[PDB]
Amino acid sequence: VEVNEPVLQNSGLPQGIFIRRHRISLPPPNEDQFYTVHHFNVNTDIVFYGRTFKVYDCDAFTKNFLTKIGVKLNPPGQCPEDPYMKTRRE
Amino acid sequence: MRECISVHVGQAGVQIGNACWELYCLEHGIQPDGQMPSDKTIGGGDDSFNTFFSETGAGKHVPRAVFVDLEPTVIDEVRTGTYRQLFHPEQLITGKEDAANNYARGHYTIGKELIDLVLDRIRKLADQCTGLQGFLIFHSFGGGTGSGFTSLLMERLSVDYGKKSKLEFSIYPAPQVSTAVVEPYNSILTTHTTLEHSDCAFMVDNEAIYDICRRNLDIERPTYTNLNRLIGQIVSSITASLRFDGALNVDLTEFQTNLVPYPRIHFPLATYAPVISAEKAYHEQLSVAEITNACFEPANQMVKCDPRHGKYMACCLLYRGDVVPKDVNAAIATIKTKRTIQFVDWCPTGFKVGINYQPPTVVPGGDLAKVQRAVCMLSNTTAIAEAWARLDHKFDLMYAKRAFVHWYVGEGMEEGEFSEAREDMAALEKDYEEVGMDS
Amino acid sequence: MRECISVHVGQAGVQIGNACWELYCLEHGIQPDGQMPSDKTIGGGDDSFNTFFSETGAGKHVPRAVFVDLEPTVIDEVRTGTYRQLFHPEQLITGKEDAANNYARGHYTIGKELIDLVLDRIRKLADQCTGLQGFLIFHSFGGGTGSGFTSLLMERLSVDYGKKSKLEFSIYPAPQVSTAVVEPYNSILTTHTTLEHSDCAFMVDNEAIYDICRRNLDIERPTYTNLNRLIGQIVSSITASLRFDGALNVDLTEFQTNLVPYPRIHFPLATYAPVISAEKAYHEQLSVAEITNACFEPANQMVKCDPRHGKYMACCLLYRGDVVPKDVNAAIATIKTKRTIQFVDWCPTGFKVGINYQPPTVVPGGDLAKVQRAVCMLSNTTAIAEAWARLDHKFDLMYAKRAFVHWYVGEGMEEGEFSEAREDMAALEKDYEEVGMDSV
Amino acid sequence: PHYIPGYTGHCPLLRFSMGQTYGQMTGQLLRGSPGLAWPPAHRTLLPPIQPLSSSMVPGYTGFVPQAQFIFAKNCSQVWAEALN
Amino acid sequence: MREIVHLQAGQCGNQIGAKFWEVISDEHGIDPTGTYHGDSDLQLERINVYYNEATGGKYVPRAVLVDLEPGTMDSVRSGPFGQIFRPDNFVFGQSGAGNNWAKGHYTEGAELVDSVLDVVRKEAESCDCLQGFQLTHSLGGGTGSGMGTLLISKIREEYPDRIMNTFSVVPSPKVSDTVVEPYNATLSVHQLVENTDETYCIDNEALYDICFRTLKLTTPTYGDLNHLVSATMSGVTTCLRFPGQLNADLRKLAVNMVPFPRLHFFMPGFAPLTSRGSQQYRALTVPELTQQMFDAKNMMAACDPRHGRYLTVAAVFRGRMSMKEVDEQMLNVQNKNSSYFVEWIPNNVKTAVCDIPPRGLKMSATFIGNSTAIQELFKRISEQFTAMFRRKAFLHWYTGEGMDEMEFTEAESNMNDLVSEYQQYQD
Amino acid sequence: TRLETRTHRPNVELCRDVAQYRLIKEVDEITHNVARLKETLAQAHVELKGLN
Ligand SMILES: Nc1nc2c(ncn2[C@@H]2O[C@H](COP(=O)(O)OP(=O)(O)OP(=O)(O)O)[C@@H](O)[C@H]2O)c(=O)[nH]1
Ligand SMILES: Nc1nc2c(ncn2[C@@H]2O[C@H](COP(=O)(O)OP(=O)(O)OP(=O)(O)O)[C@@H](O)[C@H]2O)c(=O)[nH]1
Ligand SMILES: Nc1nc2c(ncn2[C@@H]2O[C@H](COP(=O)(O)OP(=O)(O)O)[C@@H](O)[C@H]2O)c(=O)[nH]1
Ligand SMILES: [Mg+2]
Ligand SMILES: [Mg+2]
């Protein structure tokens, strides 16, 4: 599992690759085992390294692959707009 | 009988003055709005308020105070504070624009748009009283509000009010740590006009309080609230023989006959002995002979001049609480046997002792403890020669190339007044040398 | 009155002081927050405590001791343990950076920064005395402030405080078993300073207590806090005549008159006689004849030196408990009849006894039993000279090549003061040689 | 809830009203002012009111969380605000 | 009641000036239509220092907006906070200054400075007891420099006891946005060495240096640069609008900084400027702002302060901090760095502490240095300009509008005189 | 709740007995049966995925 951030323009943060490509272990209840395909779905929160990301959409290829495997996807949620970038754009 | 007025001038004078008057309402029974509540068993006699209070009718007590400055932004939070109703409104007299660190803009330009009005309020306060023990002046040697308007006030009070006692309180500008750049320029034009109209004159510099608030009290990072809380306890001890009866009491007019050898040497030093913290002073006792040592310690003094290389001219102690005359005279026998303390050759009597029954009153929100007994000291030592002679150099670095003089000169004074006030400060440098040389 | 102020220096000095201030608080009635209980009375009343403790108005007892260290993390367990409400804060004097097992980093450079503070706090503990008996010093000859700032401590205590008694207990370096490699440069250069400044000086080796435990108190694997609880049983027993009333008293001044013949020889030995465990305590009757016999014995001595290679100059027995003055004298007269326990020719009297009523106190968590009577000894034998020569060899092994010498010379220190100090330790081995040769 | 007569500063809508004392008219403005939105978190007119932490000794030299942003207080008081 | 009326001169001055009312009105709970919707009474208790008041619960700024072309004033009303200005104060003309100092001073602005001095003095006679004036302009053109210099000499000769401010984004070597840029600048310091109480000098070259290095701002427009200036125009008028444990008005910093009567060019820089990435990893404390006031990176003017000598330093803080720790850290710097500080002035820092911070920040600070590093911003313009007056490169667009050749050697001698009065006092 | 308020018995009465040991047995019995139900439900979900 890799996590990336696309570079937005006037945000002052260091932007780019966030977690390097490696197998990621689970939260400490059942700590030893790593992530697999089944834990991943849409409109859920996934915890990597003390950080709980929120998932809101997929790809078309990901929809086809996950529906092939057998999971029914949730309805897609939405991403709340960044207040600083909204203020700077307007 | 025994009333005394207190005027606070300057932002430093007012902000000290808020601390002194939350001390004096809590000292007595009086609430913040001025009403003394009925039947609540306070520790005064009957007229224990009267030395700092008037008495209007329906259980209301008004202070004997007047707060003055040239800028309005620092008395307006006294006109809206918790103590807004305590004072009569026609005391807090504010100007329109400020001198902004000039004598020459306070003593010479804008002080005369206001000095006519405080000297009509000084009448209506001193018209009411029976007989004045003496005014109290509160000010700082930094700026021109608290040091230039102060100087014209004492040119006008020493003429109009005879020889009533005028105990000023100063803050000498700390040499290392300082705010203004022209602090020595203000503080050497001051000694020319406060060698003649202050009957007593005290000094406390801000840098020394910062050490005591670090070591003894354990307030790392003090602010200006803590520093003015301990100035009030020192003034509260000089006035506690007015209002509360004592086992051996000394008044305002008996320091002056006893502290001051010659009529040009009236700069004492003030110490308070169990300045100490409540979470720590649970452990140590405070005997009379223990807190007499802490007065004479070099580190506990309140102006950064070491008394070990100066020889004392007198002392003037003041004991409050649970103290007996045996344990006082036992401790003075110990101090005169140590070789480190030098007393001057022509002072064989040495000391001056006051004993009270009224303990120092703790202030909630404050930082000290509830101690049974405490000591102040009014030393008069030779060590003040090094607190003039290390602000008389910072003056003369800057005046030798005439930096900043072009601002004072335009607003009503000449080039000789900086010169006239510099030999008048190296004249007093010689009296502290010629007096302490032994026989 | 009868007051004595203890100064504890170094990590070994603080960790000894903790073990012997848990003893004193339990010896009198004092709880670990200073104040005695009000519902019960553990100790029967008097002002016994007023030679270690001191009282404010509200009935709180705060000890007259100052702990020092040049390193800030051994005091910080005193400040957080059970006895943190007992000590007034400015008695727990602490440093900023360590001493690094040098002397010249604790005698010339870093010891100068904390000699100003400790000589204004101890004048506020000797102000509130009326009659001060004398100081106590607790340290070890290994470290850098436990043995480098302690030399500069006593060089000023002999100046401003005249000749009040500066009694020191000490830890001598064990010579086979020793933690540091740097050790003989320490314990030569500090004996040269505490010759002319200390009034009495007891040595105890850490190795020599390790086998007093494992044979008598059958503790294989002793920790340093099993080891420190025996030292408090010595420090209390030499001062138990000051506090607790006795059939025959001895103060601190009457030791030095009766143990030290000449002004360099103030190095006693120690032995606590019924050092026994509670699985073996109540089957033996610990009669006074069999806890005076077991106190001269060369196994049980607390320094790694043997009294069968020299000859005794003076003894100082300290009985304590259920003892009668007659059975003391019936067992002194047995020891003197031996041809192996050799006493020196110019001391035909030999002994100094002291009898005290109060039995020694058992510590919760400790190892010894509550015994009914107990004995000390402060023997002054000729056989200390063998422990001068084993230190002299290991110093001289290194110093003929100048090993570790650049660490001391580079810190404000003359490079020829290692040879002043070896002739102060080569003169002192002849003094023990010449007070042992017989008069004929 | 009024300001005392010597007070200098800004009060809304003084300059149009007439023929009243300062304290009476200031009371009238603080009571009735429908046109202007009077703020809720106002800090001027105060009400007149009368004028572990012990698990470590006042000399303890170690790290205490969040206790370098607190000021004007004792060691025990700064530790009390940092923990509790 | 120490009120100050505001003047905004030129396209540079209006964009800087309209941002200052977008930040000060945000400091006082005021919506874009001007009325009050605030949260405290400390917002409203000294709001009459930059405002009149109109009936109905609305306040209007005391600003007069001046230009020569009418194009820029359409852009200020079309801005988001343009509704609040009184329309009687928009004073401007028909034609343009031509990016000429001379054609905006002699020819064109003289028919319009009569109209400015009627709406300026209407503000100044309605005041309670007037304290000061303000002016925002750039030293590189016609409307900012030229007529904005003429208006100062008419305010001063009628009100010579008030206090006066001036703001300047002075021209730079490395960036260059006008080819006659030194002719405009070198002539225009003639009335800023003689005829102003104060003048701050800022550099557009080092505005870009903070925005890329400190804030990591990828593409800074002119909106963010003017935000970075407006937090220092705010910073000097903080003790005048808000209480303090120690106080410093306009007049106090006039007396204390300026040693001699013609050295009043200052060097501002806001302290807790920090980036969005390192906002979460950074601690605010009173030592830590002092570390960032003083380094040569955050100075707004493009001179290096460690190339000269500091004469005096101001530091107008903002927040609840300890007055030991403020005074501890100025003893720190003068005794640590002691070559860079002047030798015949013993305490070289003026300090001040306010109470109500900038909104959002728990603590903040400001800095007003006066150094002898300012001569490399005057001497560097001098050789930038004297290359062109040798061959008379552009003079027929100034000489033909009413002036002669002696008025540059009159104003090059005076420009060299100011540089000569720093190597006097620096060494 | 049964163990939590049985442990407040006064001195001497606090004794180990058959009730205490049977309570300690049955709490572990209940946790074991809960874990078995968790396994059966977690594998029923993957067969539901297969049917989809
Ligand atoms: N002890 C104490 N000193 C203070 C306090 N406030 C300011 N100071 C000192 O006062 C000096 C400045 O002089 P001020 O008395 O404030 O000058 P001023 O009288 O207010 O003159 P203006 O500011 O023009 O009104 C500085 O050195 C401060 O250290 C205070 O609250 N307590
Ligand atoms: N008897 C005994 N000896 C100890 C104890 N703790 C340490 N030692 C001895 O102490 C010596 C080392 O010195 P330190 O304990 O470090 O004393 P110090 O003053 O801290 O020395 P520095 O670390 O250099 O500052 C070694 O000889 C140890 O054997 C103890 O609890 N009991
Ligand atoms: N701070 C700032 N400076 C500007 C802005 N626009 C232009 N400038 C500067 O102003 C200079 C132009 O001179 P200017 O005063 O605008 O000419 P004028 O207004 O037409 O008289 C250029 O050197 C620019 O560096 C802006 O939006 N903000
Ligand atoms: Mg002021
Ligand atoms: Mg150590």
CATH (domain of E107)? 3.40.50.1440
Chain breaks after residues in chain E, where C lies over 2.5 Å from next N: none
| Other Cβ atoms within 10 Å of D76 Cβ, number | 17
Domain boundary among E354, E374, E394: E374
Pure H helices in E345-393: 375-386
List, in order, residues 6 or more apart from E94 with CB less than 8 Å away: E70
Calpha distance E20→E231 (Å, rounded) = 8
Under 8 Å between Cβ of C340 and C301? no
Distances (CA, A) of C386 to C310, C425, C426: 9, 12, 12
Chain A interface, best mutation among E218, E224, E278, by max A CB count within 10 A? E218
Q: Could you tell me which of B141, B56, B116 has the C-alpha nearest to residue B391? A: B141
Q: Which two tokens stand for residue B251?
A: 């008044």
Structure determined via: cryo-EM
Residues E387 and E367 occupy one common structural domain: no
Cβ–Cβ gap D44/E45 under 8 Å? yes
Calpha distance E241→E28 (Å, rounded) = 11
Pick left, alpha or beta for residue C135 (phi over 0 → left; psi -120 to 50 → alpha; otherwise beta): beta
Q: Does E277 touch chain A (CB under 8 A)?
A: yes
Residues E203 and E317 occupy one common structural domain: no
| Other Cβ atoms within 10 Å of C30 Cβ, number | 24
Under 8 Å between Cβ of C135 and C157? yes
Packing angle, helices E406-426 and E181-188, rounded to 10:
70
Under 8 Å between Cβ of B335 and B341? yes
Which residues of chain C are within 8 Å of residue D61 when distances are taken between CB atoms? 72, 76, 94
Which residues of chain F are within 8 Å of residue A69 when distances are taken between CB atoms? 49
Residues E226 and E344 occupy one common structural domain: no
- Separation of CA E379 and ligand 3 centre (Å): 22
Under 8 Å between Cβ of C94 and D59? yes
Is residue B61 packed enough to be buried (19+ CB in 10 Å), middle (13-18) or exposed (0-12)? buried
Calpha distance C87→C21 (Å, rounded) = 11
Which residues of chain A are within 8 Å of residue E281 when distances are taken between CB atoms? none
Calpha distance D53→D71 (Å, rounded) = 16
Residues E132 and E175 occupy one common structural domain: yes
Under 8 Å between Cβ of B260 and B268? no
Q: Which residues of A touch F (CB under 8 A)?
A: 38, 69-72
Under 8 Å between Cβ of B62 and B76? no
Residues E323 and E289 occupy one common structural domain: yes
Calpha distance C372→E352 (Å, rounded) = 74
Q: Which two tokens stand for residue B342?
A: 């030098």
Closest Cα in chain E, distance from residue B28 (Å): 28
Calpha distance E109→E147 (Å, rounded) = 6
Cβ–Cβ gap B285/C56 under 8 Å? yes
Q: Is B21 helix (H, G, I), strand (E, B) or coil?
A: helix
CA nearest to E284 within chain D: D69
B353-389: burial string, b at 16+ Cβ within 10 Å, e else = bbbbebbbbebeebbbbebebbbbbbbbbbbbbbbbe
Calpha distance F8→E308 (Å, rounded) = 79
Calpha distance D38→E367 (Å, rounded) = 36
Q: Are strands C318-321 and E349-352 parallel, antiparallel or unpaired?
A: unpaired
Q: Say how far residue D7 (Cα) sits from the centre of its chain.
A: 18
| Other Cβ atoms within 10 Å of D69 Cβ, number | 16
Calpha distance C219→A46 (Å, rounded) = 56
- Greatest CA separation for chain D: 66
Calpha distance B33→E326 (Å, rounded) = 35
Calpha distance B43→E415 (Å, rounded) = 74
Under 8 Å between Cβ of B157 and B124? no
Q: Where are the beta strands (DSSP E) in B226-283?
A: 269-272
List, in order, residues 6 or more apart from B414 with CB less than 8 Å away: none
By residue count, chain B amounts to 439
Tell me the sheet residues that pair with C93.
C68
Calpha distance B209→B353 (Å, rounded) = 25
- The amino acid occupying position C100 is A
Q: Is E16 helix (H, G, I), strand (E, B) or coil?
A: helix
Tell me the sheet residues that pair with E341.
E310
Residues E73 and E201 occupy one common structural domain: yes
Ligand nearest to the CA of residue C95, numbered in listed order: 2
CA nearest to A90 within chain E: E80
Residues E357 and E383 occupy one common structural domain: no
Calpha distance B233→E206 (Å, rounded) = 53
Calpha distance C183→E248 (Å, rounded) = 63
Under 8 Å between Cβ of E178 and E381? no
In the DSSP assignment, the letter for residue E81 is T
Residue nearest (by alpha carbon) to ligand 2 atom 8: C12
Calpha distance C390→C402 (Å, rounded) = 19
Q: Where are the beta strands (DSSP E) in C253-378?
A: 318-321, 355-356, 373-376
Q: Say how far residue E157 (Cα) sits from the centre of its chain.
A: 22
| The total number of structural domains that make up chain E | 3
Q: Which two tokens stand for residue B50?
A: 């009267």
User: Was C290 annotated as part of a binding site?
Assistant: no
| Other Cβ atoms within 10 Å of C157 Cβ, number | 20
Under 8 Å between Cβ of B29 and B42? yes
- Separation of CA E141 and ligand 3 centre (Å): 8
List, in order, residues 6 or more apart from E353 with CB less than 8 Å away: E244, E245, E246, E317, E319, E321, E323, E326
Distances (CA, A) of A18 to A24, A49, B115: 13, 11, 71
Residues E50 and E165 occupy one common structural domain: yes
Phi then psi dihedrals of residue B235, to 5 deg:
-70, -35
Q: Could you tell me which of C395, C410, C394, C400 has the C-alpha nearest to residue C104? A: C410
Residue E299, ligand 3, Cβ within 6 A: no
Q: Which two tokens stand for residue E401?
A: 């509008």
Q: How far apart are the first and last CA of chain D?
A: 35
Torsion angle of alpha carbons B36, B39, B43, B44, nearest 10°? 60
- Separation of CA C182 and ligand 2 centre (Å): 13
Which residue bears the tokens 């005392």?
D4
Long-range (24+ apart) CB contacts under 8 A made by E287-292 are E287/E325, E287/E329, E287/E332, E289/E317, E289/E363, E289/E364, E289/E365, E290/E315, E290/E329, E290/E330, E290/E332, E290/E333, E290/E365
Ligand nearest to the CA of residue C142, numbered in listed order: 2
User: Was C144 annotated as part of a binding site?
Assistant: yes
Distances (CA, A) of B13 to B19, B67, B403, C302, E240: 10, 8, 28, 70, 20
Q: Are strands B317-320 and B374-381 parallel, antiparallel or unpaired?
A: antiparallel
Q: Are strands A45-48 and A51-54 parallel, antiparallel or unpaired?
A: antiparallel
Which residue bears the tokens 């046997």?
B337
Calpha distance D29→D27 (Å, rounded) = 6
Q: For a substitution probing ligand 1, which of B7, B8, B9, B11 has the most ligand atoms within 8 Å of its CB? A: B11
Residues E320 and E417 occupy one common structural domain: no
- Greatest CA separation for chain A: 48
Q: What is the CA radius of gyration of chain D?
A: 23
Q: Which two tokens stand for residue E331?
A: 């003893």
Q: Is E144 helix (H, G, I), strand (E, B) or coil?
A: helix
Under 8 Å between Cβ of B313 and B436? yes
Cβ–Cβ gap A69/F50 under 8 Å? no
Under 8 Å between Cβ of B283 and B351? no
DSSP states of C348-396 as a string? SS-----EE-SPPPP-TT-SB---SEEEE----BSTTHHHHHHHHHHHH
Calpha distance E41→E174 (Å, rounded) = 47
Q: Does C207 touch chain D (CB under 8 A)?
A: no
Pick left, alpha or beta for residue C42 (phi over 0 → left; psi -120 to 50 → alpha; otherwise beta): alpha
Under 8 Å between Cβ of C213 and C219? yes
Residue C220 annotated among the catalytic residues of the structure: no
Q: Say how far residue E230 (Cα) sits from the centre of its chain.
A: 9
Q: Is B133 helix (H, G, I), strand (E, B) or coil?
A: coil
Torsion angle of alpha carbons B222, B224, B225, B231, nearest 10°? 100
Domain boundary among E213, E239, E257: E257
CATH of the domain at E302: 3.30.1330.20
Under 8 Å between Cβ of B402 and B93? no
Residues E179 and E282 occupy one common structural domain: no
Residues E133 and E73 occupy one common structural domain: yes
Helix (H), strand (E) at residue A46: strand A45-48
Under 8 Å between Cβ of C341 and C312? yes
Under 8 Å between Cβ of B109 and B85? no
Q: Could you tell me which of C89, C78, C84 has the C-alpha nearest to residue C33? A: C84
| Other Cβ atoms within 10 Å of B349 Cβ, number | 8
Catalytic residue, chosen from C254, C386, C417, C429, is C254
Domain boundary among E208, E240, E257: E257
Q: Could you tell me which of C87, C157, C90, C92 has the C-alpha nearest to residue C119? A: C157
DSSP states of D32-78 as a string? --SSS---SS--SS--------SSS-TT--S--TT-SS--SS-HHHH
Helix (H), strand (E) at residue E406: helix E406-426
Is residue E157 packed enough to be buried (19+ CB in 10 Å), middle (13-18) or exposed (0-12)? exposed
- Separation of CA E243 and ligand 4 centre (Å): 11
Q: Could you tell me which of B72, B77, B73 has the C-alpha nearest to residue D44? A: B77
Quote the Cα angle for B390-B394-B398, to 5°: 160
CATH of the domain at E421: 1.10.287.600
Closest Cα in chain B, distance from residue E250 (Å): 9
Cβ–Cβ gap B285/C55 under 8 Å? yes
Calpha distance E139→E151 (Å, rounded) = 15
> Could you tell me the residue range of the domain that residue E380 belongs to?
375-425
Q: Does C72 touch chain D (CB under 8 A)?
A: yes
Residues E369 and E381 occupy one common structural domain: no
